[PDB]
Design a protein around this ligand. Structure first.
Ligand SMILES: CC(C)(C)c1cc(C(=O)N2CCNC(=O)CC2)c(NC(=O)Nc2cccc3ccccc23)s1
Ligand SMILES: CCCCCCCCO[C@@H]1O[C@H](CO)[C@@H](O)[C@H](O)[C@H]1O
Length: 332
């Protein structure tokens, strides 16, 4: 066991190994940047807020730890370390996770640099590559947005989840469909891509219903083929009295853009989730001809998420979370 030191950072107590120094808050869990003396690199340390307060908190803590231990891909957040000051299961109450610090989020980059077409190919390529991996573990992000995309000075990107969101959300989620295929994530990529291309938020909705209104103005009101799959009688009625609205031709909307980028956006921003391109299919799209390597777009090992169906006691989730802290093995 290492030697821990304590310190208070903005009305929070932080107890971490001496390994990590120069902690400075960046987020509120809450997150500090820090300097990892063992490598010389900068890290982000997340301290879980109240990890075992309820059964539901306890399950989310275990969820995040299990997920982060599983993710081993260049374009997805990965765990460098996980630690607790606690000397035993009965003492266990705090959880800290450590990852490589990337210097900026994509939101930051989009505001005072107009990206070139080459930049858009590389940034979206990477989000797709990391998504192919996440999806191959039967995980859905569900909140992909520029603030969840950490980017370095070489514009290398990783997907994470800090935890409006609305501007990037698939319309089925905002109408609580409850099913949700993984292409809800592809909807988000289409919104991100549009905004990388134009400099402007695609669907800057003011609230929940304005969000859907703006979405339908671009993509059109549901076509017969979509309406045929709608099981809920209310939904169909809720839909049939919004404005009878045409799909816009995206070629007309994203004026200056590479026609291959317009094509790909048409294949992402389809209302019917069944007809949206998959991350794997997208990686093969000619827009990414300069980046695609089918031998280097890997998939995840199988991910057991049977815990998701289980209704356990706090201390059960807590001993499970403790087990995973102990079995952690750092990357090379
Ligand atoms: C991208 C992917 C793989 C779908 C993630 C899911 C979650 C997650 O927690 N879950 C998302 C799904 N929903 C929930 O129930 C929570 C679990 C992540 N968690 C984090 O990205 N955590 C962190 C965020 C910001 C800073 C960090 C610094 C060091 C370590 C981790 C950090 S990333
Ligand atoms: C008024 C706005 C209408 C939004 C229509 C969203 C339809 C999304 O697409 C649907 O998603 C489901 C997965 O959630 C699938 O089961 C359906 O088969 C598919 O058609």
């Amino acid at each position: 066991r290492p030697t821990f030191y304590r310190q208070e950072l903005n009305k929070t107590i932080w107890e971490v190994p001496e390994r990590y120094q120069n902690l400075s808050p960046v987020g509120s869990g809450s997150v500090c940047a820090a300097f990892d003396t063992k490598t010389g690199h900068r890290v982000a340390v997340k301290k879980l807020s109240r990890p075992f307060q309820s059964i539901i908190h306890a399950k989310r803590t275990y969820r995040e730890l299990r997920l982060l231990k599983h993710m081993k891909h260049e374009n997805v957040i990965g765990l460098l370390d996980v630690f607790t000051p606690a000397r035993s299961l009965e003492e266990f109450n705090d959880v800290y996770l450590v990852t490589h610090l990337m210097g900026a989020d994509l939101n930051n980059i989009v505001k005072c640099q107009k990206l070139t077409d080459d930049h858009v190919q590389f940034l979206i390529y990477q989000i797709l590559r990391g998504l192919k991996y996440i999806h191959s573990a039967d995980i859905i992000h569900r909140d992909l947005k520029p603030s969840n995309l950490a980017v370095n000075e070489d514009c290398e990107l990783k997907i994470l989840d800090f935890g409006a969101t609305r501007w990037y959300r698939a319309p089925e989620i905002m109408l609580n469909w409850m099913h949700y295929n993984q292409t809800v994530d592809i909807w988000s990529v289409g919104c991100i891509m549009a905004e990388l291309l134009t400099g402007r938020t695609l669907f800057p909705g003011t609230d929940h219903i304005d969000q859907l209104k703006l979405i339908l103005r671009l993509v059109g009101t549901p076509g017969a083929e979509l309406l045929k799959k709608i099981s809920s009688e209310s939904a169909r009625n809720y839909i049939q009295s919004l404005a009878q609205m045409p799909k816009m031709n995206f070629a007309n909307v994203f004026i200056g853009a590479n026609p291959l980028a317009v094509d790909l956006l048409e294949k992402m921003l389809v209302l019917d989730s069944d007809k949206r391109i998959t991350a794997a299919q997208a990686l093969a799209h000619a827009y990414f001809a300069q980046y695609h390597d089918p031998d280097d777009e890997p998939v995840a090992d199988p991910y057991d998420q049977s815990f998701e169906s289980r209704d356990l006691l706090i201390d059960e989730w807590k001993s499970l979370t403790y087990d995973e802290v102990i079995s952690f093995v750092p990357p090379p």
